Amino acid sequence: GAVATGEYRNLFAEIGKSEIDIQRKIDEAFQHLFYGDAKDAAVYYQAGGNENGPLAYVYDVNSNDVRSEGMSYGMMITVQMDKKAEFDAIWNWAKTYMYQDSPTHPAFGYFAWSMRRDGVANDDMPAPDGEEYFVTALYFAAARWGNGEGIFNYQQEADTILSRMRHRQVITGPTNRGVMTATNLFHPEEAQVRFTPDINNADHTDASYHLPSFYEIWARVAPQEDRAFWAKAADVSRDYFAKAAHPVTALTPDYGNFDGTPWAASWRPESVDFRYNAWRSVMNWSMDYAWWGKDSGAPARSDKLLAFFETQEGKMNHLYSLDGKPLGGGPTLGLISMNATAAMAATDPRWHNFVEKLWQQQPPTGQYRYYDGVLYLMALLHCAGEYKAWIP
Ligand SMILES: O[C@@H]1[C@@H](O)[C@H](O[C@@H]2CO[C@@H](O[C@@H]3CO[C@@H](O[C@@H]4CO[C@@H](O[C@@H]5CO[C@@H](O)[C@H](O)[C@H]5O)[C@H](O)[C@H]4O)[C@H](O)[C@H]3O)[C@H](O)[C@H]2O)OC[C@H]1O
């Protein structure tokens, strides 16, 4: 794997792009999404400052609300791109406004998944892949830049947040939504990330939240007493993808049960299909295979997923049944982007076409550019050999 050798595949170079052009492409993506026109192009906003210096956020320009996912992806993008100033400003906002620091609040130790631009939470509860990316980006920051103090002691922040994700106790108390009860963020016996710590829907998962590539990082650098647990989670996730992905198409559902079966959320029964969450599953397993070389099923799974999307050429939807029936929409940049990241594991040379397809895109504009854009920029970095394990 790339971590052992230090050699990350440059998939764009493999399909014949020059390094000058690859650098232009990444830089254009970043400049547009971070510093482009505020109404049509940018998803990053500078929001004054406080005692820790500048504040900024990545946000869903559609809803006009901040998402913990977007903040955490912002941090990952910026650390990968060596953009410390933007990283610190995003982190300052997440830690200042999103992080729940009251030990009697049921979201204690978690980041509000949905928050308004003035810091008013829409929902105090987390979207746990936010936490997963926050912790990992923080470890990467420590590696690349060294640790600061206070909230910029990135390694100490990561250790605390991660320990609490495993060891959080059950807490019942007041929130913006009424009295709620929440637990830990990983199931202690299953060693799987939860879809939610809310006790009413806690015993479920989401394939797109499984990040064995990052669990391996935590297995190396987390507090000692948790390293075996994280190592176990990495094995468990590799098995999870093998069970959860359809055996013909490799499509996964948005939401899932611990045993690998789809889960229909009461408020969103269509979660059993391949939708906006599940786009990312192939990135997660392909990244894991590229870095660590342990998911022996990842190459065949990525081959199957690309073989399926090849049958959709010219009639591309972005919502599918797991067996491959189109359920609506047209092509999206976010799905193009994630499908290109399959090439981190794929063996069949059709992967060149999917990488080429990502290469041909422009940065997103208009109302849906946040989710399309953060997926786009992450996929550009993976495909350029610029998204690396920075181990402290
Ligand atoms: O129930 C709560 C959970 O929902 C919560 O999870 C978080 C929110 O949901 C997930 O992230 C969101 C995924 O959906 C995105 O919305 C759209 C989806 O469509 C994308 O593509 C468009 C499709 O249509 C085309 O016409 C158009 O051109 C395309 O761009 C669009 O780009 C997206 O913006 C949201 O933006 C994401 O935030 C994820 O699980 C969590 O972030 O967790 C708590 C739980 O209580």
TrEMBL record:
Gene Ontology molecular function terms on file: cellulase activity
Root EC class: hydrolase
EC number: 3.2.1.4
Naturally occurring in which organism (per UniProt): Teredinibacter turnerae (strain ATCC 39867 / T7901)
Catalytic reactions on record: Endohydrolysis of (1->4)-beta-D-glucosidic linkages in cellulose, lichenin and cereal beta-D-glucans
Gene Ontology process terms (BP): cellulose catabolic process
Keywords, ordered alphabetically: Carbohydrate metabolism, Cellulose degradation, Glycosidase, Hydrolase, Polysaccharide degradation, Signal
Assigned protein family: Belongs to the glycosyl hydrolase 8 (cellulase D) family.
Stored Pfam families: Glyco_hydro_8
Lineage: Bacteria, Pseudomonadati, Pseudomonadota, Gammaproteobacteria, Cellvibrionales
Name listed for the protein in its UniProt record: cellulase
